[PDB]
Amino acid sequence: VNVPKTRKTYCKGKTCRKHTQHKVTQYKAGKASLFAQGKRRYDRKQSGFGGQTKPVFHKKAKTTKKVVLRLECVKCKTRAQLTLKRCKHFELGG
Amino acid sequence: NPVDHPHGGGNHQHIGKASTISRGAVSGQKAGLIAARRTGLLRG
Amino acid sequence: GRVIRNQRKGAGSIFTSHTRLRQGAAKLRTLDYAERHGYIRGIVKQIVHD
Amino acid sequence: ATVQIRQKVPHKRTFLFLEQLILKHNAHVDTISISEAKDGLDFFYAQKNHAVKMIDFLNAVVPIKHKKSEELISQDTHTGASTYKFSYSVEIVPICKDDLVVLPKKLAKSMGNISQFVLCSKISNTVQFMDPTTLQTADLSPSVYWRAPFNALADVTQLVEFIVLDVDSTGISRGNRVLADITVARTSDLGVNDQVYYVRSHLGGICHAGDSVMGYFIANSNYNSDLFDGLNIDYVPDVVLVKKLYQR
RNA sequence: CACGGACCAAGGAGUCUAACGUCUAUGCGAGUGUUUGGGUGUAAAACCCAUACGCGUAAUGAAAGUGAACGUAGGUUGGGG
RNA sequence: GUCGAAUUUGGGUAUAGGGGCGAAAGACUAAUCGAACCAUCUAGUAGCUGGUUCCUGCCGAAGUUUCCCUCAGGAUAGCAGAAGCUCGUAUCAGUUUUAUGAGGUAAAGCGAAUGAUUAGAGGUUCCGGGGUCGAAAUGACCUUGACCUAUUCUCAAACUUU
RNA sequence: AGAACUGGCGAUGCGGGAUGAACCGAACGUAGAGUUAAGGUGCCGGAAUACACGCUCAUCAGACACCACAAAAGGUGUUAG
RNA sequence: GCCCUGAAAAUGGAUGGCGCUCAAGCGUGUUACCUAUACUCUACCGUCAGGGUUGAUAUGAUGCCCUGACGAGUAGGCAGG
RNA sequence: GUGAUUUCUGCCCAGUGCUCUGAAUGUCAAAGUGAAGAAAUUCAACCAAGCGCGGGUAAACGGCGGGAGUAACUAUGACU
RNA sequence: UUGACAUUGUGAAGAGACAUAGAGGGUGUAGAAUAAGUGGGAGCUUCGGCGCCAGUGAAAUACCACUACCUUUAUAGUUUC
RNA sequence: GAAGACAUUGUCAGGUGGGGAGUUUGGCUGGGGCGGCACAUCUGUUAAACGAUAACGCAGAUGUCCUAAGGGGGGCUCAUGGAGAACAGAAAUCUCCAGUAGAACAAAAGGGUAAAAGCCCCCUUGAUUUUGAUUUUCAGUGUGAAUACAAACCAUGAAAGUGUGGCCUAUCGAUCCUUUAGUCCCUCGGAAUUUGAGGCUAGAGGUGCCAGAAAAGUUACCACAGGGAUAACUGGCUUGUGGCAGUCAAGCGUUCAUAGCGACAUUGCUUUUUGAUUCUUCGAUGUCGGCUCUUCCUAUCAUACCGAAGCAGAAUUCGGUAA
Ligand SMILES: [Zn+2]
């Protein structure tokens, strides 16, 4: 599927609150920090003889990912997130 | 029977796996040829 | 599982050596001055079976 | 008795090859009935000994995970020797000749420390793999696959055609295949855009500048595979050339 | 032609508790609860008791935090008496 | 069967439980061994089996929905009981009539549709897919491709106007 | 084997079908008198060896529906048409 | 329409049995008769409902009195004993 | 492991195992070193054995099929 | 089993990475020519030095947009073997 | 005497480690097991004129595709047939007539659609924001998908108007955890600053066993609680098939349809055969055959008596009562 690098869309900004030009770009996730409470807890729990203590997911089924677009206003630099359907092929139409 | 020995058991008399054991194996595994660089007869 | 006879040979108790009829430990004599310097003479009294 | 052949994929490239080969060798003589199915089919026989014959025929040409099950027909008295209906379940490996795969880490570390980005190259009793970035061939057995099965990342349908521009055969060579440093563009960006992709393929000895080839375009793809998510995205090729679409 | 039962006697199986829900009875009533403890005692009872505490009288929000009358404490339809 | 020995045997002595011993049977280890015996944790847990103590009166079912590694079971709704509260013959009913709506089954009616049409004479184009092998330069192979009108014959029968 | 509607059994005795979980009738406090249901009235068995028009004689007749089995093909055997 | 042949299975046996042949069989029709915990009437128990009675007698209303209807029941619920 | 004696014990090291007196960086933990930062921390290089590569090994586990061609015919328990 | 720290003291040599200047960095028939990306590049230079066309070309040269394959020593040392 | 600050010993870290330990090894189901997914969903039919209605019932389908195949507007009309035009052919392009849709609308089937919902062209991003009400599956909970308005901002068009994704019906996902966007909001609880962390509001990463455990086998050494909810031998129902019988009997039987054998079929019998059911037995119905012994049936091998025969006799065949 294709989606161009720009579109005119509603900015929720305090100043805009209008249809403005928005630069779209695909959403890539972060790096999964180590000082997150739920990673610290996991470390503390694995620390011991014990075993593996939490589950581990094997039984995948999905072969796709929902596409998320990060839009950014060109005059406010305010950002937003839109979601699309699942697809196997996605590129930005420069 | 297999309790008694690793070679044990089977509806025939067969080892199943190789008799060339490692050197870093443990007590109860070292039942065979222990650190074989070689096996078998050379020529006669 | 059980333990194999190789594993049971290490505590002994039936796999010991049978040591009643043995004359003794066969061992050269101790290294002393007579044997580091010059020599010393000895004599055989009997050949026996161990 | 009967055997139940299945390949758990929509496109079944190793199946048409298989049945073509079966008719070529004429190993379908005691077949009393051929029943189609969802993803494969069946072959029916009146004695276990002719079914196992064809299983032996299959386990030499293609990779399989075969089994056996029994249902009881009639408990014959006065003998104790009853009769039965048998059923073998043949599962072909779901990987075809030209598929992009991502092996697991510990298997790749054992099959020569080959990269996980891999193309299947040849289907036989074993399944053969090749790294196109650098000529490294491996071979995997079904007894090792079915221990820890994985599935392809992209089939032949997801291929898309490219147009090659420059072919530098500076790379090393092997039998029948030679490494190159091609530059190549897409036939939806040429004429309209001017972005090009450089690829260290294995087709420096086949494809010349100005002919249409076929490859996977990874950058536009939206994959979800926990193994693909375990790789260094920066050392991934953005294109993977496979074959040539010679003009006829 | 499913299971138990040869016969008699005695014994023998939805209880006690902590915290709770609906309902009911009683006491007091925006209050209520004496009984941790104290005074006292005809002595494990009965009788008397301050302070505090608990529940309630104010909710909401993740939290900071703010915090309930426009009105004869509203209008309309019905409503027992 | 064996009977001068790898013999039989008393006593003493060593090996003790996931351990011992085994010329190896998973055999023997105090009538106990695919892991002894004794006491305790222990009234082990059991969606399973069995049983469950006096009378009379009144009302009185369900084996069905949804979810559950769910199918000898639970929660949930339903059925049922009891407690009653506000009111006092409303406006209700497993029912009929009148008026006004939805339906597309039974019945009726039509010829038809791709195969085996029991087929019949033929019309040939290349209209090709897919598999393998293609240091693809030019490209071959086993494979599946083809069809042309006449539509009979008996009714195989897919449909819809009402 | 799996469904739809109603009814019933299960949870249900009573009269009848000899007998029967389901059929027919009919649903139950204790008793008396009367009348009936479904079914029956030769005797067992309470009740007409009652009346009337006809058919049948079977060397395994036939005889209360569910129900406990019966077809095609034949007979100048007979009856009527 | 009836009857016969077709229609053969294994302990001795089943219109329920005896037995029946102008039937005690079959078809159809007319009366009479038998009898169920059903229907009608009456008495009695109990429950449900409605109403009268603190005139005031045994102050009690826990009751007393009149009227009508109803009563099956497993699991299970409540009440009175 | 095999199971007196006699005669024999064939071909396979691809696979799994075992092994090595073979190569060097492909991976490669903790500590340690360097850089940024105010610091916690983060990143990078270096990096043991092992893995991986190469070799050997069958009286080690074990395995020992199917074709296509030798000119009229024939393609052999031969040859390619 | 392998590594690190400690136990654990006293040494001597050698080699190796960083840390400033180095430049030796460019080698298929060969085009004069020992050719990496490049940069407008036919010109800035004293003599024009060559180049531009030319010539194998893979390379296109001078000069530099000046990053430049970038090789071994010397430094105060920083420290692994 | 040897070795020597190396070993050893202690603590961490990596590898190896069924030698050993602990546990698990889904469901539906004409038994279970293969196979299939009827395990989450869609269409027609089952389905019997509202609606609901099952089967491992039938024919198929989904886990996608699209910045246009979405949205608005304008212009035109399709499949096909006929008559014609050089190369031109059954078929290349052009022109006329007919043409209710016989075309197309991403994809299953069904419905729908003609100055369009189709074919071409133009402008665009309603595939946007805030949160709620409602319909469907349904407990009237979720998820998913849709319906109709409101408050904003936008598009398109002359305007009316339409547009909150695809013409409608399917095309997808909780807690925990991580991450991003936002208010630049809250908190880090002795008071402050900067990092860092935790929080609120909307989203994504996913559980397809699709209201969502993290999981390989074997037992013929086996064991326990139980089950005719359920296979096991026995029975009882059923007759596809087994065995037997009757009517039609093409035709074969020296010419001479049954002296005899045999088509097509057709009705139909027995439980003395398999299949099917799972109704009785799972806290004992002792399970193959043979030895022995008794009785019964007739669908008669012989014996007895009859009848018919391409029955001279003889010998046979068929047939009837007859067990
Ligand atoms: Zn903005």
Side-chain angles (χ1 to χ4, degrees):
Chain A
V1 76
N2 286 35
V3 170
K5 53 175 281 178
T6 37
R7 63 189 287 181
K8 286 196 184 111
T9 315
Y10 188 92
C11 215
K12 300 163 70 174
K14 208 60 60 187
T15 53
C16 289
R17 260 165 207 166
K18 59 191 199 204
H19 267 79
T20 68
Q21 189 71 259
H22 286 220
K23 269 170 177 298
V24 303
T25 175
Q26 216 184 334
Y27 156 83
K28 199 190 80 154
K31 309 294 170 54
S33 159
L34 295 95
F35 306 105
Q37 181 64 100
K39 179 49 155 53
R40 311 209 289 273
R41 195 181 285 134
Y42 193 65
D43 301 357
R44 176 72 193 278
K45 225 189 199 198
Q46 295 288 334
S47 81
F49 288 120
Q52 183 67 203
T53 73
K54 300 286 273 276
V56 299
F57 187 79
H58 303 126
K59 299 181 69 53
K60 284 280 282 286
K62 306 263 181 289
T63 52
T64 43
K65 274 176 169 183
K66 278 188 186 133
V67 188
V68 174
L69 315 163
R70 191 176 63 85
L71 279 62
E72 186 174 5
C73 216
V74 296
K75 41 163 77 178
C76 187
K77 301 300 185 182
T78 310
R79 305 197 265 286
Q81 271 179 144
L82 269 77
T83 166
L84 313 179
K85 309 214 185 161
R86 311 189 182 261
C87 52
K88 304 190 175 201
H89 285 287
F90 171 78
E91 60 180 359
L92 279 304
Chain B
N1 287 292
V3 289
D4 294 294
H5 201 270
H7 296 220
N11 290 351
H12 293 234
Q13 268 190 5
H14 75 122
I15 301 172
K17 303 194 163 294
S19 52
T20 66
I21 305 290
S22 181
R23 167 61 77 202
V26 288
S27 318
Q29 298 182 344
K30 276 173 201 173
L33 319 175
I34 302 298
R37 319 197 198 97
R38 198 180 186 288
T39 53
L41 196 75
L42 187 140
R43 287 295 307 277
Chain C
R2 288 195 201 286
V3 299
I4 316 163
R5 61 173 143 71
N6 67 9
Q7 283 173 248
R8 300 196 283 100
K9 280 154 94 94
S13 87
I14 69 159
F15 305 94
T16 65
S17 67
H18 307 161
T19 51
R20 182 189 50 136
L21 302 167
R22 310 220 191 167
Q23 311 297 345
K27 285 189 193 324
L28 273 52
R29 65 198 301 276
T30 314
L31 204 57
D32 40 355
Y33 184 70
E35 201 170 359
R36 304 202 297 278
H37 310 66
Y39 59 89
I40 190 167
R41 186 176 74 179
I43 177 155
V44 178
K45 301 305 293 173
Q46 51 172 335
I47 317 306
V48 290
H49 171 59
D50 205 40
Chain D
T2 196
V3 312
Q4 304 145 334
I5 315 174
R6 278 101 172 86
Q7 207 188 356
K8 301 312 177 40
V9 288
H11 181 211
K12 33 190 185 187
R13 170 163 184 176
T14 194
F15 192 86
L16 282 299
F17 163 57
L18 172 60
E19 67 91 18
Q20 166 175 300
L21 190 146
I22 276 165
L23 303 185
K24 170 166 188 171
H25 282 228
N26 206 302
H28 56 294
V29 298
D30 213 314
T31 71
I32 61 171
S33 71
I34 302 181
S35 163
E36 293 265 326
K38 193 86 219 90
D39 44 13
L41 56 78
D42 308 63
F43 287 111
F44 286 69
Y45 297 126
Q47 52 259 35
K48 189 196 200 190
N49 318 306
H50 283 238
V52 184
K53 193 262 162 195
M54 204 188 55
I55 288 165
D56 295 17
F57 177 67
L58 291 168
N59 215 332
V61 293
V62 299
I64 56 172
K65 180 169 84 83
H66 87 274
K67 301 188 285 297
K68 205 183 79 169
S69 185
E70 190 209 357
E71 71 183 277
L72 180 58
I73 288 281
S74 55
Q75 193 71 332
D76 192 326
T77 37
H78 316 279
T79 48
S82 61
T83 191
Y84 40 62
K85 266 197 233 197
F86 282 150
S87 47
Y88 297 73
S89 308
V90 184
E91 291 107 10
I92 301 163
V93 180
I95 297 160
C96 313
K97 193 204 179 290
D98 298 354
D99 313 284
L100 184 82
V101 309
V102 171
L103 305 168
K105 200 163 173 64
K106 297 290 162 202
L107 173 51
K109 280 194 195 150
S110 64
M111 276 207 312
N113 205 329
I114 195 180
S115 199
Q116 301 183 229
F117 256 102
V118 153
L119 299 150
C120 204
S121 307
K122 205 177 83 191
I123 309 307
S124 72
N125 46 17
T126 59
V127 54
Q128 192 208 310
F129 293 124
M130 192 215 69
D131 188 9
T133 304
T134 185
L135 277 300
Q136 186 164 356
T137 291
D139 204 87
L140 158 66
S141 89
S143 52
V144 173
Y145 182 102
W146 293 108
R147 278 177 222 178
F150 58 101
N151 192 358
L153 192 70
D155 307 276
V156 185
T157 74
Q158 306 303 292
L159 275 170
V160 62
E161 56 156 18
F162 295 78
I163 300 302
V164 56
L165 271 46
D166 309 68
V167 185
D168 307 359
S169 194
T170 176
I172 59 151
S173 182
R174 267 195 208 200
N176 192 256
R177 275 178 184 187
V178 58
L179 202 78
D181 212 345
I182 297 162
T183 193
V184 61
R186 203 180 65 175
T187 183
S188 48
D189 292 327
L190 64 92
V192 300
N193 311 332
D194 195 17
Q195 64 172 1
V196 186
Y197 307 94
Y198 298 80
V199 183
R200 296 278 286 170
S201 171
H202 65 288
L203 305 173
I206 314 298
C207 290
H208 288 72
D211 66 347
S212 200
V213 306
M214 192 64 65
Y216 301 87
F217 186 26
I218 316 312
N220 82 326
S221 56
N222 184 265
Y223 294 145
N224 196 19
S225 200
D226 54 309
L227 315 160
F228 179 86
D229 312 311
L231 307 178
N232 198 239
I233 188 58
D234 312 290
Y235 307 146
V236 179
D238 315 327
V239 189
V240 169
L241 279 85
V242 171
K243 72 184 201 189
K244 174 161 152 166
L245 178 68
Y246 183 39
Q247 186 268 305
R248 278 92 64 189

